């Protein structure tokens with residue numbers, strides 16, 4: 001019942017919900033129980049990289065991979081020497097010999113871009129990684145890697161409340177690249193938790209958040225609307241929703257497996273929600 005999408009033009013076919021951004025805890029036995037359940041749910045994409053300051057314990061993930069490596073798409077994150085030495089450390093902890101998707105974090109336009117690209121290409125030629133991508137909300141970085149590199153994915157914060165990525169979707173898609181979503185529920189603001197009084201989100205004030213929760217369609221839970229809004233864009237290959245329990249993972253799976261938005265439902269959310277753009281790092 002978990003559908004998959006092609007990650008860019010790569011050979012990786014990733015579950016629409018990916019797993020990351022959940023603590024596996026201190027007990028290895030409990031951690032492996034959590035991972036077994038994740039995989040049992042049909043999630044096959046595991047990103048160990050920090051998302052919102054929460055990553056996955058690589059030693060624990062490594063033990064969960066045992067006997068089924070080929071069935072899992074493993075992503076991690078990281079001048080040529082640094083990029084090479086870094087993935088070696090992850091592989092040792094993960095007890096495997098290749099990463100499916102190796103992603104650059106912290107890229108800027110002032111980095112040594114040719115050197116960086118060459119590092120990833122050499123790792124890919126040698127089979128240490130299968131593909132590479134970036135994690136970025138900087139259009140100037142995105143444009144450079146799309147023009148100059150063979151990235152297959154860009155990880156971006158994206159939700160009903162942060163539509164800044166959408167400006168770049170046509171460009172990304174024209175290059176045959178996919179987006180991997182973080183923050184699809186806006187860190188809880190698109191769920192059942194209260195809106196903290198007086199606090200906003202990006203260019204929303206508190207009162208605008210309150211109003212938008214009320215005005216959005218009420219025929220689906222807000223959490224489901226949020227995940228299905230992300231998925232309603234073909235450029236999106238997978239969404240990495242946050243979870244701090246197996247119950248929360250199952251809730252995410254159920255919402256991703258619900259009926260997709262129609263064209264109409266999508267156009268409706270598009271009208272109701274703000275459509276902001278990135279102010280910084282555009283060029």
Ligand SMILES: OC[C@H]1O[C@@](CO)(O[C@H]2O[C@H](CO)[C@@H](O)[C@H](O)[C@H]2O)[C@@H](O)[C@@H]1O
Nearest residue numbers: 200202203204205206208273274275276
């Ligand atoms: O120029 C006003 C115009 O901007 C929007 C963009 O969504 O709202 C922004 O500006 C308001 C006035 O400063 C703020 O109250 C609001 O929080 C902010 O997003 C539009 O709603 C508005 O028409």
Ligand code: NA
Nearest residue numbers: 166167168277
């Ligand atoms: Na534009």
